[PDB]
């Protein structure tokens, strides 16, 4: 019931609906409330809400934000989430001066991979991994949030919605119109996010689909049948694509060590089949000395 919650303030908008910070008056628990109005529907309960709730109820993991409850008021649906203090995007911006300490970048990536491997193991694609949807707390945890664009997949996959993933974090196979995409698209997003944590700027900040592809191409080289069998047969591939040489990863993210570059290269493999799985990535030498330190800044 909403009567037990005292609202503290409006946090912002999710992928769908409006988010508030609130406090459970009886237990003291601080929560985030996602309000989805049904009065403007018209079409009943939005598919995005149906998926978010059904999928999140199954996914209990320390690196996936916890859905605590779902409350139906007269004309409203309230999703009650555990509260986290900040999103990764704002944290990176705050870290403009000092940068983010390696152990923290490493801890976050390690945690993100755990969260994602759990989603994939439970047949869920997130499909919108970007720093804005990755939430951190004062204890050093980071968690996947906003499953408004997620969906349950099958083995093997069939064609799903084409318009997925925020552009900057969108995999080449989506950009090229592949009839099938799968768990690899979330790994691509995490790779972009890995790079972004190191530089604190988006790896591939396109402003259109073709601009996005060319940025990828100019960095990783224009893919051919050797690196990515089937690429020239893809629905939106064009023989006129400029052919850029691939550049050393040492130049893509100069601060990164050999282990980090190795891992990043595997997360950004053109061929979805060769691209590393979140599960396999957990055992990458990059994480041999991983710990879980608190953020270096007050949140």
């Amino acid at each position: 019931s909403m009567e037990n919650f005292q609202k503290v303030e409006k946090i912002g908008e999710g992928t769908y609906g409006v988010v508030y910070k609130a406090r459970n008056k009886l237990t003291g628990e601080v929560v985030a409330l996602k309000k989805i109005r049904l009065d403007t529907e018209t079409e009943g309960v939005p598919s995005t809400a149906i998926r978010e709730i059904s999928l999140l109820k199954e996914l209990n993991h320390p690196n996936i934000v916890k859905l605590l409850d779902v409350i139906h008021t007269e004309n409203k649906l309230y999703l009650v989430f555990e509260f986290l203090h900040q999103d990764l995007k704002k944290f990176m911006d705050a870290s403009a001066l000092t940068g983010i300490p390696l152990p923290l970048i490493k801890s976050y990536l390690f945690q993100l991979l755990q969260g994602l491997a759990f989603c994939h193991s439970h047949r869920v694609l997130h499909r919108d991994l970007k720093p804005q949807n990755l939430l951190i707390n004062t204890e050093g945890a980071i968690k996947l949030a906003d499953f408004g664009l997620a969906r349950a997949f099958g083995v093997p996959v069939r064609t799903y919605t084409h318009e997925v993933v925020t552009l900057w974090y969108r995999a080449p196979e989506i950009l090229l119109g592949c009839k099938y995409y799968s768990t690899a698209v979330d790994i691509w997003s995490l790779g972009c996010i890995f790079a972004e944590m190191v530089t604190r700027r988006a790896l591939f900040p396109g402003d259109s689909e073709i601009d996005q592809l060319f940025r990828i191409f100019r960095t990783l080289g224009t893919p051919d049948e050797v690196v990515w069998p089937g690429v020239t047969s893809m629905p939106d591939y064009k023989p006129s694509f400029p052919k850029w040489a691939r550049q050393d990863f040492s130049k893509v993210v100069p601060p990164l060590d050999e282990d980090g570059r190795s891992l990043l290269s595997q997360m950004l493999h053109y061929d979805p089949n060769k691209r590393i799985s979140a599960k396999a990535a957990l055992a990458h030498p990059f994480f041999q000395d991983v710990t879980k330190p608190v953020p270096h800044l007050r949140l």
């Binding site: 009943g44 998926r51 999928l55 199954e58 083995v155 599960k279």
Partner: protein, 258 residues
């Protein structure tokens, strides 16, 4: 070879037990019967074909209906409202482009209002506690298909066709889990088209043998033999289509040699 394929199979095996309807609910429904349910599911098949919905959507809807009826008594006049809301929810969950609500209202030939269909949607969600990601016969089939050598369209289509037939008849199919019905369906399809049997590799993956599939298989074989005489024919009509390789035109085996 899609990764997580084993993790996912294991997880679906766990979830299907948790998503299972009460096997004996129909006897506890004072005003509805197996025959009424068959008529409803056969109608949903038609709806699915009309709006070119995925088979997965159909299977999910039937799962929602059976679970709903496992806990809510329903008068016959409202059965179709339950089914309609279920198909709408399945579509929203599963389709890239679900039909609009007005379309679901329209297909009930104006038996119910948009208001009713939307309120029922809400009730269905509450009754299922929003747990909509149910394992289906379809989901297990598409996994089993990966074990063909080589892949065969007729086999795949015939398996889906048989799995779909089981949706219609609560007696006896409410008694079998999706993974088991899918097992019987895959074997039956394989044996019909190619002469082959439940492969060693699926015994390793599932723990099921022909022996453990036998009871469901005996049922499905009978359902298959009698399909042309079944009161409900929408699935047979559907599977005459070149889309499903006209597998409903295939002749069922006279014996299985169990």
């Amino acid at each position: 070879v899609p990764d997580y394929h084993e993790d996912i199979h294991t997880y679906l095996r766990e979830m299907e037990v948790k998503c299972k309807p009460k096997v004996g609910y129909m006897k506890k429904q004072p005003d509805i019967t197996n025959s009424m349910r068959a008529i409803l599911v056969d109608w949903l098949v038609e709806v699915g074909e009309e709006y070119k919905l995925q088979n997965e959507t159909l299977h999910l809807a039937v799962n929602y209906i059976d679970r709903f009826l496992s806990s809510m008594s329903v008068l016959r006049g409202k059965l179709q409202l339950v089914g309609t809301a279920a198909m709408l929810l399945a579509s929203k969950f599963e389709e890239i482009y679900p039909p609009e609500v007005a379309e679901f209202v329209y297909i009930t030939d104006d038996t119910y209002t948009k208001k009713q269909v939307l309120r029922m949607e809400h009730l269905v969600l509450k009754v299922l506690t929003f747990d909509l990601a149910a394992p289906t016969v379809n989901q297990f089939l598409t996994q089993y298909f990966l074990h063909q050598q080589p892949a065969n369209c007729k086999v795949e289509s015939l398996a889906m066709f048989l799995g779909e037939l089981s949706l219609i008849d609560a007696d006896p199919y409410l008694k079998y889990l999706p993974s088991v019905i899918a097992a019987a369906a895959f074997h039956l399809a394989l044996y019909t088209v190619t002469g082959q049997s439940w492969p060693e590799s699926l015994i390793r993956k599932t723990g099921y043998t022909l022996e453990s599939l036998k009871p469901c298989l005996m049922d499905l074989h009978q359902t298959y033999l009698k399909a042309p005489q079944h009161a409900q024919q929408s699935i047979r009509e559907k599977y005459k289509n070149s889309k499903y390789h006209g597998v409903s035109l295939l002749n069922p085996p006279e014996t299985l040699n169990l």
